[PDB]
């Protein structure tokens, strides 16, 4: 039996599917099927401060050399005609209470992906909200104060977590994707899960950010590459700053980057240490998005039709059950 439900359990994965299924139960639509949510990878990693920032702040003892975090991979599956169809997947970076500033108590979405075959089509949007709001609610409960989202769609014919998408599933334009996350976060605010949210520029302004060493530094994020480019440009200068370039860049791309406050004011100051109840889950196939993208490209595990998607889901589960 190589079904999604059979995969090992986590406090995180069960919190999410319960939120999804309670929602669907209430909706009581006859075309909906049971959804199952599973964390298929959990490992401890570090994000190393890149050369420019290392020479400016690390070498002077002003900034930590690296930031420890936990990476988790999790996927969601719905029963569509007696069989599991993987319609959502996500990779996250979690920086706990032992992490040095500016990263402590922060979560970041590395990549998120979906296959538009959730049944019915009229309930897709609402189900995506349940998973994402549920993840925010879950980490807030553990004592993570902030969520970070880089709302950016893929490049020219680019695939994130799933191999070969339906040609019908259009790559959203940036303003559509931004509006989507704004709407999900307004809903999380109304449910009293998110205290408030802000764009990166407005957030640094309100935090009185004066140095590049104060900006959260995540694996594969836009801002560590911007700082590198900016330092290179500034070091090339001869005469016969960094923060002002950072503020200008942040203003220019502000709508793309969300800073989500889950815990506000004094409640965020007297928190106990973050204790994750879930154990580490070694699974090389799901350590980052590349290993599953390769296995799916080699074994032709496609998601370009409902039938092709259901097929590749089955294969995915057989591979996940082997380890
Ligand atoms: C040949 N065809 C292709 O390659 N198709 C194709 C289309 C889209 C995308 C990819 C490939 C790769 C990744 C992805 O790119 C992207 O931006 N998203 C999010 C996205 O589309 N949504 C936001 C969303 C969805 C589900 C959630 F749980 C949370 C948030 C929708 C609903 C929106 F945009 F409408 F809000 C993707 O899943
Ligand atoms: Na993404």
mmCIF file of C-alpha atoms and ligand atoms in Angstrom:
data_model
loop_
_atom_site.group_PDB
_atom_site.id
_atom_site.type_symbol
_atom_site.label_atom_id
_atom_site.label_comp_id
_atom_site.label_asym_id
_atom_site.label_seq_id
_atom_site.Cartn_x
_atom_site.Cartn_y
_atom_site.Cartn_z
ATOM 1 C CA UNK A 1 0.000 0.000 0.000
ATOM 2 C CA UNK A 2 1.873 3.047 -1.358
ATOM 3 C CA UNK A 3 -0.670 5.768 -0.520
ATOM 4 C CA UNK A 4 0.044 9.259 0.884
ATOM 5 C CA UNK A 5 -1.829 8.463 4.163
ATOM 6 C CA UNK A 6 0.535 5.494 4.902
ATOM 7 C CA UNK A 7 3.676 7.818 5.067
ATOM 8 C CA UNK A 8 5.043 8.559 8.630
ATOM 9 C CA UNK A 9 3.359 11.222 10.803
ATOM 10 C CA UNK A 10 4.388 14.622 12.089
ATOM 11 C CA UNK A 11 2.709 17.061 14.513
ATOM 12 C CA UNK A 12 3.125 19.651 11.623
ATOM 13 C CA UNK A 13 1.583 17.577 8.762
ATOM 14 C CA UNK A 14 -1.487 16.507 10.729
ATOM 15 C CA UNK A 15 -2.162 20.102 11.935
ATOM 16 C CA UNK A 16 -2.350 21.145 8.225
ATOM 17 C CA UNK A 17 -4.569 18.326 6.818
ATOM 18 C CA UNK A 18 -7.025 18.659 9.767
ATOM 19 C CA UNK A 19 -7.383 22.371 8.911
ATOM 20 C CA UNK A 20 -7.945 21.459 5.207
ATOM 21 C CA UNK A 21 -10.455 18.559 5.800
ATOM 22 C CA UNK A 22 -12.510 20.506 8.430
ATOM 23 C CA UNK A 23 -12.805 23.252 5.797
ATOM 24 C CA UNK A 24 -13.907 20.766 3.074
ATOM 25 C CA UNK A 25 -16.349 19.001 5.514
ATOM 26 C CA UNK A 26 -18.111 22.366 6.129
ATOM 27 C CA UNK A 27 -18.164 23.172 2.383
ATOM 28 C CA UNK A 28 -19.687 19.680 1.850
ATOM 29 C CA UNK A 29 -19.072 19.771 -1.957
ATOM 30 C CA UNK A 30 -19.794 16.324 -3.635
ATOM 31 C CA UNK A 31 -16.775 16.631 -6.020
ATOM 32 C CA UNK A 32 -14.178 17.103 -3.235
ATOM 33 C CA UNK A 33 -11.990 14.245 -1.938
ATOM 34 C CA UNK A 34 -10.010 13.732 1.295
ATOM 35 C CA UNK A 35 -6.702 15.687 1.444
ATOM 36 C CA UNK A 36 -3.536 14.259 3.145
ATOM 37 C CA UNK A 37 -0.489 16.406 4.174
ATOM 38 C CA UNK A 38 3.002 14.981 4.767
ATOM 39 C CA UNK A 39 6.439 16.329 5.832
ATOM 40 C CA UNK A 40 8.854 14.136 3.722
ATOM 41 C CA UNK A 41 12.166 15.830 4.812
ATOM 42 C CA UNK A 42 13.612 17.649 7.858
ATOM 43 C CA UNK A 43 17.354 18.397 8.202
ATOM 44 C CA UNK A 44 19.555 20.939 9.913
ATOM 45 C CA UNK A 45 21.531 23.246 7.572
ATOM 46 C CA UNK A 46 23.428 26.590 7.601
ATOM 47 C CA UNK A 47 23.396 29.611 5.350
ATOM 48 C CA UNK A 48 26.885 31.092 5.096
ATOM 49 C CA UNK A 49 27.315 34.875 4.762
ATOM 50 C CA UNK A 50 28.752 35.507 1.203
ATOM 51 C CA UNK A 51 32.239 37.139 0.565
ATOM 52 C CA UNK A 52 31.358 40.878 0.406
ATOM 53 C CA UNK A 53 29.204 40.847 3.553
ATOM 54 C CA UNK A 54 31.725 38.507 5.291
ATOM 55 C CA UNK A 55 34.621 40.970 4.780
ATOM 56 C CA UNK A 56 32.479 43.944 5.853
ATOM 57 C CA UNK A 57 30.682 42.546 8.926
ATOM 58 C CA UNK A 58 31.762 38.994 9.729
ATOM 59 C CA UNK A 59 35.598 39.682 9.776
ATOM 60 C CA UNK A 60 34.991 42.787 12.046
ATOM 61 C CA UNK A 61 33.032 40.555 14.488
ATOM 62 C CA UNK A 62 29.776 42.475 13.844
ATOM 63 C CA UNK A 63 27.771 39.620 12.245
ATOM 64 C CA UNK A 64 27.534 35.835 12.658
ATOM 65 C CA UNK A 65 29.574 33.940 9.968
ATOM 66 C CA UNK A 66 26.576 31.664 9.270
ATOM 67 C CA UNK A 67 22.943 31.062 10.363
ATOM 68 C CA UNK A 68 21.639 27.611 11.465
ATOM 69 C CA UNK A 69 18.174 26.547 10.252
ATOM 70 C CA UNK A 70 15.948 23.543 9.633
ATOM 71 C CA UNK A 71 14.667 22.807 6.145
ATOM 72 C CA UNK A 72 11.391 20.932 5.716
ATOM 73 C CA UNK A 73 9.759 19.549 2.604
ATOM 74 C CA UNK A 74 5.988 18.931 2.701
ATOM 75 C CA UNK A 75 3.391 17.958 0.099
ATOM 76 C CA UNK A 76 -0.429 17.872 -0.098
ATOM 77 C CA UNK A 77 -2.499 15.156 -1.934
ATOM 78 C CA UNK A 78 -6.304 14.910 -2.713
ATOM 79 C CA UNK A 79 -8.276 11.707 -3.595
ATOM 80 C CA UNK A 80 -9.481 12.266 -7.201
ATOM 81 C CA UNK A 81 -11.241 9.139 -8.633
ATOM 82 C CA UNK A 82 -10.104 6.728 -5.888
ATOM 83 C CA UNK A 83 -6.391 7.795 -6.160
ATOM 84 C CA UNK A 84 -4.000 10.470 -4.652
ATOM 85 C CA UNK A 85 -3.159 13.544 -6.769
ATOM 86 C CA UNK A 86 -0.268 15.702 -5.415
ATOM 87 C CA UNK A 87 -1.502 19.247 -6.008
ATOM 88 C CA UNK A 88 0.817 21.251 -3.688
ATOM 89 C CA UNK A 89 4.432 21.173 -2.427
ATOM 90 C CA UNK A 90 6.646 23.473 -0.308
ATOM 91 C CA UNK A 91 10.227 23.859 0.985
ATOM 92 C CA UNK A 92 10.687 26.109 4.136
ATOM 93 C CA UNK A 93 13.702 27.392 6.176
ATOM 94 C CA UNK A 94 13.153 27.736 9.912
ATOM 95 C CA UNK A 95 15.486 29.767 12.113
ATOM 96 C CA UNK A 96 14.881 28.940 15.804
ATOM 97 C CA UNK A 97 15.496 30.656 19.179
ATOM 98 C CA UNK A 98 19.190 29.581 19.313
ATOM 99 C CA UNK A 99 19.911 31.271 15.883
ATOM 100 C CA UNK A 100 21.883 34.569 16.254
ATOM 101 C CA UNK A 101 20.175 37.842 15.177
ATOM 102 C CA UNK A 102 18.986 39.011 12.607
ATOM 103 C CA UNK A 103 17.457 35.587 11.805
ATOM 104 C CA UNK A 104 16.161 34.200 15.157
ATOM 105 C CA UNK A 105 12.468 33.134 15.332
ATOM 106 C CA UNK A 106 11.928 33.511 11.520
ATOM 107 C CA UNK A 107 10.421 31.252 8.860
ATOM 108 C CA UNK A 108 10.987 31.646 5.114
ATOM 109 C CA UNK A 109 9.332 29.953 2.167
ATOM 110 C CA UNK A 110 12.173 28.755 -0.144
ATOM 111 C CA UNK A 111 9.816 27.501 -2.918
ATOM 112 C CA UNK A 112 6.130 26.625 -3.254
ATOM 113 C CA UNK A 113 4.491 24.812 -6.198
ATOM 114 C CA UNK A 114 0.996 23.563 -7.201
ATOM 115 C CA UNK A 115 -0.717 21.490 -9.999
ATOM 116 C CA UNK A 116 -4.183 23.053 -10.743
ATOM 117 C CA UNK A 117 -6.189 19.737 -10.639
ATOM 118 C CA UNK A 118 -7.818 20.276 -7.223
ATOM 119 C CA UNK A 119 -11.498 19.172 -7.453
ATOM 120 C CA UNK A 120 -13.719 21.246 -7.510
ATOM 121 C CA UNK A 121 -11.941 24.169 -9.350
ATOM 122 C CA UNK A 122 -14.300 26.559 -7.386
ATOM 123 C CA UNK A 123 -12.550 25.553 -4.046
ATOM 124 C CA UNK A 124 -8.799 25.548 -5.120
ATOM 125 C CA UNK A 125 -8.030 29.136 -3.838
ATOM 126 C CA UNK A 126 -9.684 28.458 -0.462
ATOM 127 C CA UNK A 127 -7.697 25.204 0.058
ATOM 128 C CA UNK A 128 -4.339 26.914 -0.695
ATOM 129 C CA UNK A 129 -5.247 29.535 2.001
ATOM 130 C CA UNK A 130 -5.851 26.774 4.606
ATOM 131 C CA UNK A 131 -2.373 25.161 4.136
ATOM 132 C CA UNK A 132 -0.428 28.504 4.128
ATOM 133 C CA UNK A 133 -2.439 30.123 7.012
ATOM 134 C CA UNK A 134 -2.190 26.792 8.881
ATOM 135 C CA UNK A 135 1.616 26.796 8.470
ATOM 136 C CA UNK A 136 1.786 30.394 9.795
ATOM 137 C CA UNK A 137 -0.509 29.527 12.760
ATOM 138 C CA UNK A 138 1.610 26.409 13.496
ATOM 139 C CA UNK A 139 4.978 28.219 13.556
ATOM 140 C CA UNK A 140 3.518 31.162 15.600
ATOM 141 C CA UNK A 141 2.418 28.492 18.183
ATOM 142 C CA UNK A 142 6.062 27.193 18.368
ATOM 143 C CA UNK A 143 7.283 30.764 18.976
ATOM 144 C CA UNK A 144 8.446 31.907 15.502
ATOM 145 C CA UNK A 145 7.679 35.687 15.510
ATOM 146 C CA UNK A 146 7.975 36.363 11.767
ATOM 147 C CA UNK A 147 7.219 34.890 8.352
ATOM 148 C CA UNK A 148 8.944 35.879 5.120
ATOM 149 C CA UNK A 149 7.640 35.433 1.619
ATOM 150 C CA UNK A 150 9.305 36.264 -1.644
ATOM 151 C CA UNK A 151 6.187 36.496 -3.975
ATOM 152 C CA UNK A 152 7.894 35.824 -7.319
ATOM 153 C CA UNK A 153 6.604 33.572 -10.167
ATOM 154 C CA UNK A 154 8.962 31.292 -12.225
ATOM 155 C CA UNK A 155 11.095 32.413 -15.204
ATOM 156 C CA UNK A 156 10.746 31.670 -19.015
ATOM 157 C CA UNK A 157 9.279 28.122 -19.017
ATOM 158 C CA UNK A 158 10.584 27.332 -15.507
ATOM 159 C CA UNK A 159 9.460 24.506 -13.139
ATOM 160 C CA UNK A 160 9.831 24.764 -9.316
ATOM 161 C CA UNK A 161 8.988 21.478 -7.433
ATOM 162 C CA UNK A 162 6.825 19.511 -9.973
ATOM 163 C CA UNK A 163 8.045 18.291 -13.364
ATOM 164 C CA UNK A 164 6.100 19.413 -16.524
ATOM 165 C CA UNK A 165 3.013 21.446 -15.574
ATOM 166 C CA UNK A 166 -0.342 21.502 -17.515
ATOM 167 C CA UNK A 167 -0.077 23.936 -20.487
ATOM 168 C CA UNK A 168 -3.535 25.190 -19.263
ATOM 169 C CA UNK A 169 -2.017 26.222 -15.854
ATOM 170 C CA UNK A 170 -0.633 29.667 -16.760
ATOM 171 C CA UNK A 171 2.435 31.165 -15.047
ATOM 172 C CA UNK A 172 0.866 34.090 -13.068
ATOM 173 C CA UNK A 173 2.155 37.609 -13.738
ATOM 174 C CA UNK A 174 3.837 39.293 -10.679
ATOM 175 C CA UNK A 175 0.907 41.645 -9.778
ATOM 176 C CA UNK A 176 -1.553 38.665 -9.858
ATOM 177 C CA UNK A 177 0.701 36.641 -7.517
ATOM 178 C CA UNK A 178 1.258 39.657 -5.180
ATOM 179 C CA UNK A 179 -2.525 40.259 -5.002
ATOM 180 C CA UNK A 180 -3.007 36.583 -4.237
ATOM 181 C CA UNK A 181 -0.623 36.673 -1.231
ATOM 182 C CA UNK A 182 -2.123 40.043 -0.060
ATOM 183 C CA UNK A 183 -5.570 38.338 -0.047
ATOM 184 C CA UNK A 184 -4.337 35.237 1.845
ATOM 185 C CA UNK A 185 -2.593 37.461 4.429
ATOM 186 C CA UNK A 186 -5.726 39.740 4.843
ATOM 187 C CA UNK A 187 -7.620 36.486 5.584
ATOM 188 C CA UNK A 188 -4.913 35.397 8.088
ATOM 189 C CA UNK A 189 -5.203 38.899 9.735
ATOM 190 C CA UNK A 190 -9.070 38.592 9.974
ATOM 191 C CA UNK A 191 -8.615 35.112 11.598
ATOM 192 C CA UNK A 192 -6.240 36.792 14.178
ATOM 193 C CA UNK A 193 -3.354 34.492 13.104
ATOM 194 C CA UNK A 194 -1.196 37.211 11.502
ATOM 195 C CA UNK A 195 -0.947 40.375 13.705
ATOM 196 C CA UNK A 196 0.026 42.408 10.634
ATOM 197 C CA UNK A 197 2.162 42.309 7.522
ATOM 198 C CA UNK A 198 4.364 44.829 5.644
ATOM 199 C CA UNK A 199 6.482 45.064 2.506
ATOM 200 C CA UNK A 200 10.281 44.787 3.127
ATOM 201 C CA UNK A 201 10.894 48.606 2.664
ATOM 202 C CA UNK A 202 8.114 49.672 5.085
ATOM 203 C CA UNK A 203 9.310 47.008 7.565
ATOM 204 C CA UNK A 204 13.022 48.102 7.628
ATOM 205 C CA UNK A 205 11.826 51.791 7.943
ATOM 206 C CA UNK A 206 9.671 50.940 11.008
ATOM 207 C CA UNK A 207 12.556 48.839 12.464
ATOM 208 C CA UNK A 208 14.962 51.851 11.897
ATOM 209 C CA UNK A 209 17.327 49.519 9.934
ATOM 210 C CA UNK A 210 20.642 51.346 9.662
ATOM 211 C CA UNK A 211 22.944 48.536 8.642
ATOM 212 C CA UNK A 212 22.933 45.718 6.063
ATOM 213 C CA UNK A 213 23.980 43.329 8.931
ATOM 214 C CA UNK A 214 20.456 43.808 10.440
ATOM 215 C CA UNK A 215 18.542 42.442 7.437
ATOM 216 C CA UNK A 216 17.417 38.743 7.661
ATOM 217 C CA UNK A 217 19.807 36.608 5.617
ATOM 218 C CA UNK A 218 18.262 33.460 4.080
ATOM 219 C CA UNK A 219 19.480 30.650 1.811
ATOM 220 C CA UNK A 220 19.007 31.489 -1.903
ATOM 221 C CA UNK A 221 17.146 34.738 -1.158
ATOM 222 C CA UNK A 222 17.239 37.932 -3.293
ATOM 223 C CA UNK A 223 18.681 40.233 -0.543
ATOM 224 C CA UNK A 224 22.000 38.356 0.088
ATOM 225 C CA UNK A 225 22.719 38.609 -3.734
ATOM 226 C CA UNK A 226 21.747 42.309 -3.839
ATOM 227 C CA UNK A 227 24.185 43.036 -0.925
ATOM 228 C CA UNK A 228 26.971 41.168 -2.811
ATOM 229 C CA UNK A 229 26.322 43.136 -6.045
ATOM 230 C CA UNK A 230 26.111 46.427 -4.067
ATOM 231 C CA UNK A 231 29.393 45.799 -2.096
ATOM 232 C CA UNK A 232 31.210 44.935 -5.391
ATOM 233 C CA UNK A 233 29.914 48.241 -6.949
ATOM 234 C CA UNK A 234 30.904 50.327 -3.848
ATOM 235 C CA UNK A 235 34.399 48.733 -3.601
ATOM 236 C CA UNK A 236 35.035 49.629 -7.291
ATOM 237 C CA UNK A 237 34.733 53.340 -6.253
ATOM 238 C CA UNK A 238 37.818 55.570 -6.095
ATOM 239 C CA UNK A 239 37.602 59.239 -4.946
ATOM 240 C CA UNK A 240 40.194 62.021 -5.620
ATOM 241 C CA UNK A 241 26.903 53.936 0.986
ATOM 242 C CA UNK A 242 25.635 50.330 1.470
ATOM 243 C CA UNK A 243 22.568 51.166 3.587
ATOM 244 C CA UNK A 244 21.356 53.900 1.243
ATOM 245 C CA UNK A 245 21.760 51.535 -1.801
ATOM 246 C CA UNK A 246 19.827 48.847 0.218
ATOM 247 C CA UNK A 247 16.999 51.289 1.018
ATOM 248 C CA UNK A 248 16.767 52.370 -2.659
ATOM 249 C CA UNK A 249 16.654 48.667 -3.814
ATOM 250 C CA UNK A 250 14.124 47.755 -1.111
ATOM 251 C CA UNK A 251 11.868 50.630 -2.216
ATOM 252 C CA UNK A 252 12.091 49.644 -5.935
ATOM 253 C CA UNK A 253 11.134 45.934 -5.341
ATOM 254 C CA UNK A 254 9.093 46.407 -2.123
ATOM 255 C CA UNK A 255 5.785 44.791 -3.375
ATOM 256 C CA UNK A 256 7.558 41.418 -4.093
ATOM 257 C CA UNK A 257 8.761 40.871 -0.426
ATOM 258 C CA UNK A 258 6.432 40.257 2.482
ATOM 259 C CA UNK A 259 7.359 40.474 6.185
ATOM 260 C CA UNK A 260 4.666 38.779 8.278
ATOM 261 C CA UNK A 261 4.374 39.566 11.978
ATOM 262 C CA UNK A 262 2.852 36.484 13.752
ATOM 263 C CA UNK A 263 3.860 37.642 17.285
ATOM 264 C CA UNK A 264 3.705 41.364 18.191
ATOM 265 C CA UNK A 265 5.104 43.680 20.884
ATOM 266 C CA UNK A 266 5.733 42.470 24.470
ATOM 267 C CA UNK A 267 4.436 38.937 23.652
ATOM 268 C CA UNK A 268 7.517 38.565 21.347
ATOM 269 C CA UNK A 269 9.958 39.695 24.124
ATOM 270 C CA UNK A 270 9.363 37.088 26.913
ATOM 271 C CA UNK A 271 9.039 33.955 24.720
ATOM 272 C CA UNK A 272 10.394 30.574 25.873
ATOM 273 C CA UNK A 273 12.890 28.590 23.643
ATOM 274 C CA UNK A 274 11.433 27.089 20.392
ATOM 275 C CA UNK A 275 11.038 23.313 20.893
ATOM 276 C CA UNK A 276 10.093 21.520 17.675
ATOM 277 C CA UNK A 277 8.253 18.279 18.681
ATOM 278 C CA UNK A 278 8.920 16.691 15.234
ATOM 279 C CA UNK A 279 12.123 14.679 14.584
ATOM 280 C CA UNK A 280 14.634 15.133 11.740
ATOM 281 C CA UNK A 281 13.590 13.219 8.578
ATOM 282 C CA UNK A 282 16.542 12.210 6.352
ATOM 283 C CA UNK A 283 15.363 11.811 2.729
ATOM 284 C CA UNK A 284 17.912 12.824 0.052
ATOM 285 C CA UNK A 285 15.196 12.764 -2.636
ATOM 286 C CA UNK A 286 13.568 15.800 -0.889
ATOM 287 C CA UNK A 287 16.622 17.743 0.408
ATOM 288 C CA UNK A 288 15.877 20.823 -1.708
ATOM 289 C CA UNK A 289 13.808 20.787 -4.915
ATOM 290 C CA UNK A 290 16.528 19.467 -7.334
ATOM 291 C CA UNK A 291 16.625 15.703 -6.433
ATOM 292 C CA UNK A 292 12.812 15.189 -7.059
ATOM 293 C CA UNK A 293 13.009 17.375 -10.236
ATOM 294 C CA UNK A 294 15.774 15.021 -11.586
ATOM 295 C CA UNK A 295 13.991 11.703 -10.614
ATOM 296 C CA UNK A 296 10.793 13.024 -12.230
ATOM 297 C CA UNK A 297 12.697 14.173 -15.402
ATOM 298 C CA UNK A 298 14.504 10.768 -15.744
ATOM 299 C CA UNK A 299 11.460 8.539 -15.005
ATOM 300 C CA UNK A 300 9.150 10.930 -17.014
ATOM 301 C CA UNK A 301 6.939 11.540 -13.870
ATOM 302 C CA UNK A 302 4.820 14.338 -15.482
ATOM 303 C CA UNK A 303 1.965 16.592 -14.114
ATOM 304 C CA UNK A 304 0.613 17.971 -17.472
ATOM 305 C CA UNK A 305 -2.881 16.299 -17.255
ATOM 306 C CA UNK A 306 -5.011 14.927 -14.400
ATOM 307 C CA UNK A 307 -4.178 11.335 -15.502
ATOM 308 C CA UNK A 308 -0.392 12.043 -15.886
ATOM 309 C CA UNK A 309 -0.409 13.841 -12.451
ATOM 310 C CA UNK A 310 -2.181 10.898 -10.677
ATOM 311 C CA UNK A 311 0.359 8.530 -12.300
ATOM 312 C CA UNK A 312 3.449 10.538 -11.135
ATOM 313 C CA UNK A 313 1.923 10.957 -7.664
ATOM 314 C CA UNK A 314 1.752 7.127 -7.379
ATOM 315 C CA UNK A 315 5.382 6.774 -8.513
ATOM 316 C CA UNK A 316 6.434 9.584 -6.066
ATOM 317 C CA UNK A 317 4.822 7.642 -3.182
ATOM 318 C CA UNK A 318 6.477 4.319 -4.209
ATOM 319 C CA UNK A 319 9.883 6.148 -4.104
ATOM 320 C CA UNK A 320 9.044 7.846 -0.778
ATOM 321 C CA UNK A 321 8.071 4.457 0.746
ATOM 322 C CA UNK A 322 11.431 2.844 -0.357
ATOM 323 C CA UNK A 323 13.255 4.981 2.312
HETATM 324 C C1 LIG B 1 3.513 25.039 -18.281
HETATM 325 N N1 LIG B 1 2.898 25.545 -17.077
HETATM 326 C C2 LIG B 1 3.620 25.936 -15.969
HETATM 327 O O1 LIG B 1 4.845 25.883 -15.899
HETATM 328 N N2 LIG B 1 2.753 26.344 -14.961
HETATM 329 C C3 LIG B 1 3.079 26.836 -13.673
HETATM 330 C C4 LIG B 1 2.160 27.677 -13.068
HETATM 331 C C5 LIG B 1 2.385 28.199 -11.809
HETATM 332 C C6 LIG B 1 3.550 27.852 -11.158
HETATM 333 C C7 LIG B 1 4.470 27.027 -11.745
HETATM 334 C C8 LIG B 1 4.241 26.500 -12.999
HETATM 335 C C9 LIG B 1 5.658 26.795 -10.872
HETATM 336 C C10 LIG B 1 5.281 27.491 -9.570
HETATM 337 C C11 LIG B 1 4.018 28.311 -9.820
HETATM 338 O O2 LIG B 1 4.364 29.686 -9.930
HETATM 339 C C12 LIG B 1 3.605 30.444 -9.096
HETATM 340 O O3 LIG B 1 3.663 31.667 -9.069
HETATM 341 N N3 LIG B 1 2.844 29.594 -8.354
HETATM 342 C C13 LIG B 1 1.878 30.037 -7.385
HETATM 343 C C14 LIG B 1 0.555 30.196 -8.112
HETATM 344 O O4 LIG B 1 0.454 30.003 -9.320
HETATM 345 N N4 LIG B 1 -0.503 30.592 -7.296
HETATM 346 C C15 LIG B 1 -0.274 30.955 -5.900
HETATM 347 C C16 LIG B 1 -0.378 29.845 -4.915
HETATM 348 C C17 LIG B 1 -0.776 28.571 -5.278
HETATM 349 C C18 LIG B 1 -0.874 27.581 -4.328
HETATM 350 C C19 LIG B 1 -0.587 27.885 -3.021
HETATM 351 F F1 LIG B 1 -0.712 26.944 -2.097
HETATM 352 C C20 LIG B 1 -0.175 29.143 -2.643
HETATM 353 C C21 LIG B 1 -0.057 30.121 -3.606
HETATM 354 C C22 LIG B 1 -1.775 30.907 -7.962
HETATM 355 C C23 LIG B 1 -2.976 30.353 -7.220
HETATM 356 C C24 LIG B 1 -1.909 32.383 -8.285
HETATM 357 F F2 LIG B 1 -0.835 32.894 -8.917
HETATM 358 F F3 LIG B 1 -2.965 32.565 -9.109
HETATM 359 F F4 LIG B 1 -2.084 33.187 -7.220
HETATM 360 C C25 LIG B 1 3.022 28.282 -8.690
HETATM 361 O O5 LIG B 1 2.502 27.294 -8.189
HETATM 362 NA NA1 LIG B 2 8.065 30.208 -4.598
#
